[PDB]
């Protein structure tokens, strides 16, 4: 955001799952398009963390 | 290397495969690869990377 180091922190944050964030981020969910979750942090969802709509496909992603 | 280097780096990465001007914004189904923004999907039938055909074109949150 504010400087060249926190806008590389960001960059680097985001590729990491948001619930574990130990490991990257490896499902979006379908419908609503959320690239929230490693594997295994998706596996307990049936709606999405961040916007609760109910999930119809937990798509592997690389 | 430094910080801006690394910075550019990552922010290459994000940018669609194939005008590279946009940022990716679309998840290929069934091959889950992140190529394109979504103009540029629109062009596309198979994937770039793996060129299996595509039957859903996920928009990213
Ligand atoms: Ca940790
Ligand atoms: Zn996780
Ligand atoms: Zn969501
Ligand atoms: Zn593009
Ligand atoms: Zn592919």
């Given at each position: 955001e504010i400087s060249t180091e926190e806008q590389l922190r960001r960059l680097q944050e985001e590729?990491?799952?948001?619930?574990?964030?130990?490991?990257?981020?490896?499902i979006v969910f379908?419908?609503?398009?959320?690239?929230?979750?490693?594997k295994q942090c998706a596996?307990?969802?049936?709606?999405?963390?961040?916007?609760y709509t109910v999930i119809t496909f937990k798509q592997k992603i690389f």
């Open positions: 590729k990491l799952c948001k619930i574990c964030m130990d490991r990257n981020i490896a379908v419908p609503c398009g959320h690239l929230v979750t490693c596996e307990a969802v049936d709606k999405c963390p961040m916007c």
